[PDB]
Amino acid sequence: GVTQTPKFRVLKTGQSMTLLCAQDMNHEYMYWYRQDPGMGLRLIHYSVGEGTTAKGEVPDGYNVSRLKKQNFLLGLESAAPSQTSVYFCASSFTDTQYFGPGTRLTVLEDLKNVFPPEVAVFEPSEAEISHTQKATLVCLATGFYPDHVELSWWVNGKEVHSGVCTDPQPLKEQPALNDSRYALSSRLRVSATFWQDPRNHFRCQVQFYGLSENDEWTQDRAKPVTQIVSAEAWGRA
Amino acid sequence: QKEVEQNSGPLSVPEGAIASLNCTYSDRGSQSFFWYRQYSGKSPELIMSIYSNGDKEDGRFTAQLNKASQYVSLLIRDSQPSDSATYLCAVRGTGRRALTFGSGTRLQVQPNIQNPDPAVYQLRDSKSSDKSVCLFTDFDSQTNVSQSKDSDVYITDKCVLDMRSMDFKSNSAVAWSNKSDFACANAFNNSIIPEDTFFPS
Ligand SMILES: [Cl-]
Numbered sequence: 001g002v003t004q005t006p007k008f009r010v011l012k013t014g015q016s017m018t019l020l021c022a023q024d025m026n027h028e029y030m031y032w033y034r035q036d037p038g039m040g041l042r043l044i045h046y047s048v049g050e051g052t053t054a055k056g057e058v059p060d061g062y063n064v065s066r067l068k069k070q071n072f073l074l075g076l077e078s079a080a081p082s083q084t085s086v087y088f089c090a091s092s093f094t095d096t097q098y099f100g101p102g103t104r105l106t107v108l109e110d111l112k113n114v115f116p117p118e119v120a121v122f123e124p125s126e127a128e129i130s131h132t133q134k135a136t137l138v139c140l141a142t143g144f145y146p147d148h149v150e151l152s153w154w155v156n157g158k159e160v161h162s163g164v165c166t167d168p169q170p171l172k173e174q175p176a177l178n179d180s181r182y183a184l185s186s187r188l189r190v191s192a193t194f195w196q197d198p199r200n201h202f203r204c205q206v207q208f209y210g211l212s213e214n215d216e217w218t219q220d221r222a223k224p225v226t227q228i229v230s231a232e233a234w235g236r237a
Numbered sequence: 238q239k240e241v242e243q244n245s246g247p248l249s250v251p252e253g254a255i256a257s258l259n260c261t262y263s264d265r266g267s268q269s270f271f272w273y274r275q276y277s278g279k280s281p282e283l284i285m286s287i288y289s290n291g292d293k294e295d296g297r298f299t300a301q302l303n304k305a306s307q308y309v310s311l312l313i314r315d316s317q318p319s320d321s322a323t324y325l326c327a328v329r330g331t332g333r334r335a336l337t338f339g340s341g342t343r344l345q346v347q348p349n350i351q352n353p354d355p356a357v358y359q360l361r362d363s364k365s366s367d368k369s370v371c372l373f374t375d376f377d378s379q380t381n382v383s384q385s386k387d388s389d390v391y392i393t394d395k396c397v398l399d400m401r402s403m404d405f406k407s408n409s410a411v412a413w414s415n416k417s418d419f420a421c422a423n424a425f426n427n428s429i430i431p432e433d434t435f436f437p438s
Contacts, residue, residue: 020278031335040338041281041325042239048334056335088280095269097336099280122360122370127437131356134400138360138370139412154346165396165409168277171384173391185393185411187372189400 001025002100004089005196007211008148008226010114011079011107019103021072021089030072031056031093034065034085035102041088047072090184106146111215113179114224117144117209118122121231124195135195137233139204141184143173148209156201163189200235240264241328241339249345251378256313258342260326263307269329270302270309271336274322285311316346318397318406321361345376348397348406355380356435357421367415370422374409376431383409383427390414390424 002023009017021030028049033041035057043056047066061083063075076083084107090097108114120142124135141149147170153160165187172180186204194200210224217223242261250256258272270287273281286292286302287309293300301310309328313320323343327336352376362368373382382395392412399406412424422436 029334033338038245038340040340041337046335068410095336096271096283096286097327098283099273101280118366120366120368121363122366123363125360125372125437128356128358128372128374131435131437132287132354132375136358136360136372136409137376138372140366140368140370140411140413142368152356162402163398163400165352165398167393167396171391171393183391185409185413187396187398187409189398189409191403230362 002089002091002098004087004100004103007101009103009105009144010106010111010209010211011076012111013079013081013107013109015079017076017079017105019074019087019089019098021074021100022060022070023091024070025091025093025098026069026090026091028069030066030070031090031097032051032062032074033088033090034058035088036085048071071164079105080105081109084201087158091209104148106148108146109179111211112219113145114210115143115145115181116224116227117141117149117184117206117229119204119206119229121204121233123201123233123236127194129195135190135192136192137188137202139186139188139231141206141229143181144208145179145181147182147218149184150207151184151186152205154203154205162189195235196232196237197235198237201232202234203230203232205230238263239340240330240337241326243339243342245324245340246343247345248342249347250316252316252318252346252348254316256320256344256346258311258317258324258326258344260309260339261307262309262328264328264330264386265304265307267328268331269336270300271326271327272298272300272309272311273327275325275341276322284324284423286366313344318344318346318348318399320344321397348408350377350406350408353431354435355431356437357425358437359421368413369415369419370411370413371421372409372411373425373430374407375393376408378408380408380430381428382425385412385416386429387416387427389416390419392425392427
């Protein structure tokens with residue numbers, strides 16, 4: 001299918017980056033789109049074949065090259081906060097477009113706004129267990145910025161989706177401030193019997209996408225790099 | 238003026254019912270028509286392509302194209318909460334190579350709560366956090382949860398949980414705060430919750 005790198009990027013204003021799209025489906029046609037809240041995917045550039053490209057709806061501030069038929073590069077030479085967006089590459093045999101997974105870019109004036117999540121797990125209410133014979137664990141990811149997290153539950157070593165609900169989008173911790181830090185909550189609900197067995201290891205895993213180890217950091221607090229933060233609990237009776 | 242028009246929604250549909258998404262386009266000479274599904278934070282996936290007037294079925298999905306009336310439709314039969322997503326309508330115009338994308342319709346499929354048991358429960362940190370966290374759960378899908386107007390109180394939207402093994406779905410919302418006046422009794426005050434909502438202890 002269609003792949004892209006990177007998945008996530010933080011840039012300071014003025015900085016450069018490249019997004020690579022690749023497909024091995026022998027598609028002649030490739031497309032770069034940006035998606036922003038409350039509007040259709042907007043086409044930036046496209047290519048009809050190797051060594052040719054053409055302007056889409058919103059070409060300004062972006063360059064592209066089609067090296068071979070398999071590859072399509074998008075360049076940002078001087079990143080502007082307006083380029084904060086999700087970039088999707090796509091390819092077609094004729095008209096039907098298949099999308100890559102997307103690249104979430106955040107462009108900031110200052111990288112000292114970047115914070116990894118603090119992650120805590122809260123154990124089920126006894127009241128819930130006695131009333132329902134069920135047990136809801138809550139995981140909170142808090143104080144993170146930008147909105148670049150993937151929350152997963154892992155029970156006794158295995159990623160679980162059953163009994164899980166993660167907010168589809170994070171809360172601002174201060175809806176007022178434009179650069180508000182975020183929170184995200186997830187629930188894992190299990191039988192009260194499964195919870196009451198201490199052989200059972202519940203882990204909330206939050207992949208955060210922040211700065212590269214390469215980025216300059218002078219501040220006292222730990223450099224907010226790409227990292228996984230976990231919090232865990234064990235069953236009890 | 239938009240070349241592909243979709244209502245933003247959200248469109249709320251009860252589970253089991255037919256969800257109907259509609260799309261209009263201004264270019265009468267458009268030749269290709271597509272429905273894409275996008276889950277939040279994920280990429281567009283093709284549900285249907287359609288080229289000829291009439292119906293095209295693929296499982297629970299039916300696309301319906303009418304070039305005379307300039308609409309393309311998507312029906313999801315036996316709608317499930319897992320169908321909850323943004324649906325994007327896309328049209329290839331006359332001569333154009335690239336698709337023009339609608340701004341999408343958010344669909345919410347609300348579970349049927351057989352036996353509502355609305356309650357607000359208190360959870361304590363497994364390790365240590367300043368946070369007191371309140372879980373509203375087992376409410377009917379007709380209940381809506383508002384954000385707080387209270388500075389430093391965080392309330393999440395209702396969220397559908399599916400314990401597949403037990404063929405059991407439930408709604409929940411999470412409120413938390415480290416404020417001394419925050420209690421599970423008053424956390425969801427800015428929401429219309431059932432009377433007969435259970436507050437333990
Ligand atoms: Cl599973």
